[PDB]
Design a protein around this ligand. Structure first.
Ligand SMILES: NC(=O)NCCC(=O)O
Ligand SMILES: NC(=O)NCCC(=O)O
Ligand SMILES: [Zn+2]
Ligand SMILES: [Zn+2]
Ligand SMILES: [Zn+2]
Ligand SMILES: [Zn+2]
Lengths: 532, 112, 216
C-alpha cells in the first residue's frame, strides 16, 4: 500500500477547527487530509468510530532524573516519563538541564545539556523530548560578563537546539537576585530565547517558614501557610517590571495565584509579551487535601489521602508542591485564566517521589533523616506531583466534558499547539499539517456511545500511569475518557491500555527560536542595549 | 492618540472580529438622494449642519488589504494567524456560518 | 540618638526638633534576633521619645532585603512605632546606572533616566505586600511616582494603614530643569539654571535628588 496508516470516521480537532475528515500517514508524517480515503491504500486502518482526534499533547514542564541531582533523586527516568506520557496521550515532553557550575568558558552551558542527552541516549524512549536550561549562577558585574553569557547561550543553541532558559525567584541554592535576572534577560532577548520564571518571593517564604517552625507548626499543611498567594503575586509583579525595563518576552511557569494572574492579565492587555503556564492541580485540588477532615474534583473520592487515612500524619506530603495547592475558592480563577487568554499553555510540573517505600533517596520520607536534623518538617518534604500521564485526560474530562473549558479547540490550543509555538517546535510538532507535521496523534473513545469498551478505564489507578512511581495523587477518581490510540511519528505506541514497546523510537529534539519571543521593541526610557 | 489602543484591542482579545461598517454616499455628485450633500436642503431647514450629514464610509473592499499592510506587514497585528482569526474565522463562528465558511477544511469548507 | 541630642544641645535653636531613627543593619536570622531588636526600640522610646523608624530599599550601604524589613516590621508593630520606607528598587537602579556608564551617559540628566517611575512603583508595591503580611502600619517618604501613588491609593481604599508623604519639588519641577533646552513653576523664570547658564555642564546637579525630579 501507498501509506503506512489511515485514520477513518474520526473528528479532527485543532487549535481553531473541529470537523469530520480522514487522515493518511506515511514515513512518520501526516501526508493528507480528505473527506474519505480508500482503505486499500493503507497498510493499517483505524476506525475512530466518531471519536475526536487531537494532536499529541506537548508537556513542556516535566522533571526527570538527571545526573546533577538538582531536585535530589527522582523516580522517573526519561524512559519512564515518556512511557507515562504516551499512555496519557502526550507525545512530546520538555525536561530540564541543570547548569553545571564545574564547566567553564564558552561551552559551559552546551556541556550541561550534553550530560542529559548522553544519559538518555541509552534508554528506550517512547516519544521525543527536548530540554530547557536552568540557570542559578550568574557572573557579576553585568557589563563585563555580557560577552561570555551571550556566547554561552549561542553555543547551547548551535550545538543542542536549546532556546529556553529557566530561572527561580525562590528556593535556597536556586533563587537569584533582580540584578542577575536583568543580566540574563539582556542575553536572552539578544538571542531570541524563551525566558521562564518561577515567581515566588523567596525572602518572604524563608522568613515565614522560620516563624512557623518557631511555633512548632511543621505539618505538611503549613507548607501552604508559609507562602500565601500574595507572595506569588508580588514576585510576578516584580518580574513583569524587570521584563518591561529590559523589553524581554517572559513566561511564568505554574501560575496558581489570583494576584499573579491579575498583574499578568494587565500586562497582556497593555500588549507586553508576557506568557503564562498553569497546571491541572491548581484548577482541580484545594489545600483541604493536605490534612485530615464544585468546580474541582470531589476530594472525598480520592483514595489514600488524609481523609481515608487520618492515622497517617505524613500522607499530606503526596500533594506538596511549589507553588502550593491553594485554599478553597481559588480554583475557579484558574479555569477562567485558561479560557480568557491569561494562560498560554498548560503543563504538569511532573515531579515524582515514592510514598509507599520509605528507605530510598527518591522517597517522600526522605524528610525523615534524624542524623541530618530532619524529622518530617514540611521544609524537608520533596516538592512535586506525578502528572505527565493525567494532564490530557483530566482536561478532556473536567475541562471540556464538564464545561470548565469553553471548547475542544481551547483544549488543543493550550495543551498542544501553543506549547510547540512558544518553545520553537512548531510546525514539526503541535498540529495536524499534511507534509509538515510529525504524525503525533491521539484517538479518543467516542463520548456519546452506548457500546461497551472493555479497555476504557473508569477510574485513575497507579497501574494505569505506566510510570515508575508507586502513587498518583488522583488515585480513585472517575475519569470519563482516555486515549484509545496514541500514535507517535506514524506508529501506534499505545493501543487500548497496552504499550507497544517495539514501536518506541523517540529522539532528542533540537528546537528553533520561537516566533512568539521576538521583542516588542518598546522601552521605558531613551536607553537601548549596545547591540541596537 | 486613541488609535493605538484599538490595535492593542485587536491583539489582546478585546475585539473578536473586525468589520467595515461599509456605508456609501457620493461626494462628487450633489443632487441625488444618495449624496453627502443631501445635508443641504434649504426648503427643509437643512443648510449643511453636521446633524444632517449622512453617516458612513465605504470600506468593504479596503478592509482585508488595510489589515494585511498596516496590521501584519507594518507590525501592528501580532501575526497572519491573528489576521485570519478576526477577519475570517471568528466572524463565521459568532454569526453561525461555521464550518461552511471561515476556514480551509477538506470536505467541509466552501472553497472561499 | 544621644549623639545627635548632645551635639544640638550646644547650638542656638530657633524652634523645637525631633528625631527619626535610621536602620540599615538588621541581625539574622529573624527569630533569634527578635528579642534584642524589640528591647532596643523600647530603650530608644523610653529614653529619648523616639517612636519612628526609617529604612531604605535602595542606596548601597542602606538598602536592606525584604527578609530584614519583615524582621523590623515585627518589632515596630509590637511597639506601636511609625514605620517609614524609601521605596525604590535598588537592584534595578544599580544595574541601569552601570548600563548608562558603559555607554558614557554620565551627565546629571541621566540620574532620572537610571531610575524611571516604574522602579519606585514596583518597590512601593513590594513594601505594601510586606506590610500586609505583617499587619504593620507603613509610611512612604517622598512619593513621586504615579505607579507608586496608584498602589498606595488602592491599599488605602482597602482600609490598610498605608500613609504617604510627598514634597513640593515633585509637584512644581520637571526633569527639563536638569539639562539645556504647566501647573507648577514657569521653569524659564528660575535663575542660575541650565537655561541661563548653558556653559556650565554641571549646574543640573542643583536639582539632583532621590527619587529624581520626574518627566513633564
Ligand atoms: N515545585 C514542585 O512541585 N516541584 C519541584 C519542581 C519545580 O517546580 O522545579
Ligand atoms: N535623596 C535626596 O534628595 N537626598 C538625600 C537624603 C535622603 O533622601 O535620604
Ligand atoms: Zn518551579
Ligand atoms: Zn518545575
Ligand atoms: Zn452600521
Ligand atoms: Zn530618601
Amino acid at each position: 500500500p501507498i501509506y503506512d496508516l489511515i485514520i477513518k470516521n474520526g473528528i479532527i480537532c485543532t487549535a481553531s477547527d473541529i470537523y469530520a475528515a480522514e487522515i493518511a500517514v506515511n514515513n512518520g508524517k501526516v501526508q493528507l487530509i480528505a473527506a474519505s480515503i480508500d482503505p486499500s491504500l493503507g497498510s493499517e486502518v483505524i476506525d475512530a468510530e466518531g471519536a475526536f482526534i487531537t494532536p499529541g499533547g506537548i508537556d513542556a514542564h516535566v522533571h526527570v532524573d538527571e545526573p546533577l541531582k538538582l531536585l535530589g533523586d527522582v523516580v522517573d527516568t526519561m524512559e519512564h516519563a515518556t512511557r507515562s506520557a504516551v499512555a496519557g496521550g502526550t507525545t512530546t515532553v520538555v525536561a530540564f538541564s541543570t547548569q553545571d557550575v564545574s564547566k567553564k568558558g564558552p561551552s559551559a552551558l552546551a556541556e550541561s545539556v550534553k550530560l542529559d542527552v548522553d544519559e538518555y541516549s541509552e534508554q528506550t524512549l517512547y516519544c521525543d523530548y527536548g530540554l530547557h536550561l536552568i540557570l542559578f549562577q550568574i557572573e557579576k558585574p553585568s557589563v563585563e560578563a555580557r560577552e561570555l553569557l551571550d556566547v554561552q547561550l549561542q553555543a547551547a543553541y548551535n550545538d543542542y537546539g536549546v532556546s529556553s532558559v529557566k530561572m527561580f525567584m525562590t528556593y535556597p541554592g536556586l533563587q537569584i537576585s533582580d540584578y542577575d535576572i536583568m543580566s540574563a534577560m539582556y542575553a536572552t532577548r539578544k538571542n531570541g530565547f524563551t525566558t521562564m520564571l518561577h515567581a515566588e518571593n523567596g525572602d518572604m517564604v524563608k522568613w515565614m517558614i522560620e516563624a512557623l517552625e518557631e511555633q512548632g507548626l511543621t505539618d505538611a499543611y503549613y507548607h501552604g501557610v508559609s507562602r500565601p498567594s500574595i507572595v506569588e503575586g508580588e514576585a510576578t509583579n516584580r518580574a513583569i517590571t524587570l521584563a518591561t525595563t529590559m523589553d524581554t518576552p517572559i513566561l511564568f511557569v505554574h501560575v496558581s495565584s489570583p494576584q499573579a494572574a491579575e498583574v499578568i492579565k494587565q500586562a497582556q492587555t497593555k500588549g507586553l509579551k508576557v506568557y503564562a503556564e498553569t497546571c491541572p492541580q491548581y484548577a482541580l485540588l484545594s489545600d483541604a487535601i493536605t490534612r485530615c477532615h464544585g468546580v474541582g474534583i470531589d476530594l472525598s473520592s480520592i483514595s489514600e489521602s488524609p481523609f481515608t487515612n487520618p492515622d497517617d500524619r505524613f500522607i499530606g506530603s503526596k500533594y506538596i508542591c511549589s507553588p502550593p495547592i491553594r485554599p478553597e475558592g481559588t480554583q475557579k480563577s484558574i479555569w477562567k485564566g485558561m479560557n480568557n487568554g491569561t494562560f498560554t499553555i498548560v503543563g504538569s510540573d511532573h515531579c515524582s517521589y515514592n510514598y509507599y517505600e520509605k528507605t530510598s533517596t527518591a522517597s517522600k520520607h526522605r524528610a525523615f533523616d534524624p542524623e541530618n536534623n530532619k524529622n518530617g518538617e514540611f521544609r524537608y518534604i520533596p516538592n512535586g506531583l506525578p502528572g505527565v500521564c493525567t494532564r490530557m485526560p483530566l482536561l478532556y474530562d473536567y475541562g471540556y466534558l464538564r464545561g470548565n473549558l469553553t471548547s475542544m479547540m481551547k483544549l488543543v490550543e493550550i495543551q498542544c499547539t501553543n506549547p510547540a509555538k512558544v518553545y520553537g517546535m512548531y510546525p514539526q510538532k503541535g498540529s495536524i499539517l499534511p507534509g509538515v507535521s510529525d504524525a503525533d496523534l491521539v484517538i479518543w473513545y467516542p463520548d456519546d456511545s452506548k457500546k461497551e469498551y472493555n479497555s476504557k478505564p473508569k477510574l485513575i489507578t497507579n497501574k494505569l500511569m505506566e510510570h515508575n512511581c508507586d502513587y498518583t495523587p488522583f488515585e480513585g477518581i472517575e475519569i470519563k475518557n482516555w486515549p484509545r490510540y496514541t500514535i507517535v511519528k506514524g506508529k501506534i505506541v499505545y493501543k487500548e491500555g497496552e504499550i507497544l514497546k517495539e514501536n518506541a523510537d523517540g529522539k532528542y529534539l533540537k528546537r528553533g527560536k520561537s516566533f512568539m519571543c521576538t521583542p516588542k521593541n518598546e522601552w521605558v526610557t531613551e536607553w537601548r542595549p549596545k547591540y541596537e
